[PDB]
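Recap quiz, item 2
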Amino acid sequence: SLLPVPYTEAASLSTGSTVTIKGRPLACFLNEPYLQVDFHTEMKEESDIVFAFQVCFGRRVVMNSREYGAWKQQVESKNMPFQDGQEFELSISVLPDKYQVMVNGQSSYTFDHRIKPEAVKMVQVWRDISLTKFNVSY
Amino acid sequence: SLLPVPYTEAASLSTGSTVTIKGRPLACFLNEPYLQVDFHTEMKEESDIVFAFQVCFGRRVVMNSREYGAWKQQVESKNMPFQDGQEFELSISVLPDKYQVMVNGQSSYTFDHRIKPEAVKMVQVWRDISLTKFNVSY
């Protein structure tokens, strides 16, 4: 739809920052479309990732960091508030100790800071979604 | 680039048919973009899949069928002829007993027919690629 995907935007984050995303999966959940949001340390797509949030719709969520080019300890959740065929509103808030991921207004995932969020310079939203809103609070 | 992705095309297959695809991953291999080619029994995206071919670039390939709405026995290969950052040419030929997947001219994967290829009515190419050529031999 509206915004280009992969969507890349420079960004600065600290405690109190929120990244809000509105979009819709490109396929029914039976086909397991993905959604990924990556908080990068540089504008380059190959740069380190402080927080990677990857949804396999209908199946699971995996979260991780990529540090010095290597993926670290993967974390997995089977929590699946996303609804088949529906638009979703996703909100990632930077708390002192962690990211809080809200889905359609409900707290759904958390991920402890492995690297200070001040290291983030860029956010990328990609994989099997259409995107209508991307906003960073400043 | 040129063709819309997800790309959907009605198709009929039998022994001797070849599906040729030219495209390029949308991200470096470090980011693990996917490619998927699905041979569907109906035009609907939720219909059964006689052969699902899913590349996680730089990591693995998984192949499966979805029968009566249920994914069946997954098959996995770590063969990875795809080259980071490069355009690829992918060719899926229907042999009497199996699909043969050629990558840039080299035989790379096979998948035995679980359902006759004559059951196919539609092919979908999607996930993290740009697509410049899609052709079915008739």
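The first strand of chain B starts at residue 7 and ends at 10.
The two ends of chain B are 25 Å apart (CA to CA).
End of item.
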